[PDB]
Amino acid sequence: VQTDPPSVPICDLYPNGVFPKGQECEYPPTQDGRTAAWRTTSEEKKALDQASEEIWNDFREAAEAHRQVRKYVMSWIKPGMTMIEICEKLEDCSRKLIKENGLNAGLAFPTGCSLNNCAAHYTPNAGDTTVLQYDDICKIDFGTHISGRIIDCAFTVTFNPKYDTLLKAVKDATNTGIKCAGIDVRLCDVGEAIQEVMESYEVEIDGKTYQVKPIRNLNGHSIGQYRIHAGKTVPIVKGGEATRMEEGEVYAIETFGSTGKGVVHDDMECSHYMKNFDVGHVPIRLPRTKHLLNVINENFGTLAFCRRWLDRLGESKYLMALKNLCDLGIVDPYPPLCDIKGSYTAQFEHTILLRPTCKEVVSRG
Numbered sequence: 001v002q003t004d005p006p007s008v009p010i011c012d013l014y015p016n017g018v019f020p021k022g023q024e025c026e027y028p029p030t031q032d033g034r035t036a037a038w039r040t041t042s043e044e045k046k047a048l049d050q051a052s053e054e055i056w057n058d059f060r061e062a063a064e065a066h067r068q069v070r071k072y073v074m075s076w077i078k079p080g081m082t083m084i085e086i087c088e089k090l091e092d093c094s095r096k097l098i099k100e101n102g103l104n105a106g107l108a109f110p111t112g113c114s115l116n117n118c119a120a121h122y123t124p125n126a127g128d129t130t131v132l133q134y135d136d137i138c139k140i141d142f143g144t145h146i147s148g149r150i151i152d153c154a155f156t157v158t159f160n161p162k163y164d165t166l167l168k169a170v171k172d173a174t175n176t177g178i179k180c181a182g183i184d185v186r187l188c189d190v191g192e193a194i195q196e197v198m199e200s201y202e203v204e205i206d207g208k209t210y211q212v213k214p215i216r217n218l219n220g221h222s223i224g225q226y227r228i229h230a231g232k233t234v235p236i237v238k239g240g241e242a243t244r245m246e247e248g249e250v251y252a253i254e255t256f257g258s259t260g261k262g263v264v265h266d267d268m269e270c271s272h273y274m275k276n277f278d279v280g281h282v283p284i285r286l287p288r289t290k291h292l293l294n295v296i297n298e299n300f301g302t303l304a305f306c307r308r309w310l311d312r313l314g315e316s317k318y319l320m321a322l323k324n325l326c327d328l329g330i331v332d333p334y335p336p337l338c339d340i341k342g343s344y345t346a347q348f349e350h351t352i353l354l355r356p357t358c359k360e361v362v363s364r365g
């Protein structure tokens with residue numbers, strides 16, 4: 001049985017090594033109208049699904065850890081806490097439930113806790129005194145993995161009911177994206193459907209009215225092994241690419257709603273970094289730079305990391321070494337992504353498996 005607060009690894013809760021499936025859906029019908037039900041009973045589709053069973057089992061173990069962490073977070077996240085306090089309490093729980101073991105199991109990327117106008121990629125660095133406020137809109141976005149099978153799942157936290165319709169708009173747009181997704185579906189069609197649903201909402205916040213805008217330069221994405229962004233884009237506005245989703249792919253279906261411009265730009269101090277997946281072996285003689293790259297290669301590989309995690313590993317005076325890795329193109333910085341000052345942004349996200357037999361919303365219980 002899981003403790004209160006959670007501390008027992010998901011691995012210990014399932015002695016047989018079989019982790020719970022997420023929500024399973026039949027794929028959407030074709031434009032002509034023929035159903036995709038045939039996939040469930042097809043012997044060919046079953047064998048193929050069975051061929052990838054260990055992979056789905058890893059995503060499910062990571063998803064069960066993600067669900068237990070987020071239910072724990074919802075129970076205590078309150079204004080007055082520092083953003084550092086929130087991230088450390090969440091990560092401590094995630095490390096325990098995932099049974100962190102180097103590159104074999106762990107945290108897939110830093111805990112985003114972006115506030116208000118900032119939509120993504122904010123996590124505090126050491127010394128950040130930011131405190132969560134009653135009127136804040138906080139996007140908790142964190143990831144877990146087993147053998148690099150990543151669960152990318154996020155939700156928005158508020159305390160003031162004035163944002164309730166804004167959150168409902170974004171939740172409905174995310175559920176629309178999940179519903180529209182499937183093998184052979186055009187990525188632009190998903191984007192147009194998401195936008196249609198999000199833009200049907202009007203909200204009133206402190207006497208000002210807004211039509212909920214999707215953040216046009218943010219999007220959902222394909223997921224690869226140890227690769228958070230695998231190359232395919234799931235837009236959240238019309239005008240996108242008519243490229244299609246394929247069998248066996250994994251996607252993060254995420255949407256962002258804004259009362260601002262519906263466009264984000266890099267802002268604030270950078271906390272998130274990640275090795276460029278396409279960069280091969282680069283010999284480094286510069287000793288501090290060489291050491292930091294070895295620390296990154298050992299602890300994170302191609303998974304995203306943050307400055308707090310380098311501090312936790314006992315690294316110090318590494319900022320110039322980190323800038324060098326960025327200048328060399330080995331590491332890429334991912335600074336906070338913000339809409340205009342005074343705007344409010346919300347996000348909801350789930351991970352889906354485009355299995356040969358069905359569509360599994362693996363991060364949804």
Ligand SMILES: O=C1CCc2cc(N3CC[C@](O)(C(=O)NCc4cc(F)cc(Cl)c4)C3=O)ccc2N1
Binds near residue numbers: 152154218
């Ligand atoms: O064109 C773009 C550029 C910005 C962008 C951002 C995103 N977001 C926003 C939050 C997100 O869900 C997440 O959890 N990110 C963790 C993460 C940490 C890193 F250090 C590096 C990377 Cl790649 C990802 C995600 O994927 C999604 C699409 C786009 N499209």
Ligand SMILES: [Mn+2]
Binds near residue numbers: 152153254
């Ligand atoms: Mn995310």
Ligand SMILES: [Mn+2]
Binds near residue numbers: 220
């Ligand atoms: Mn994502």
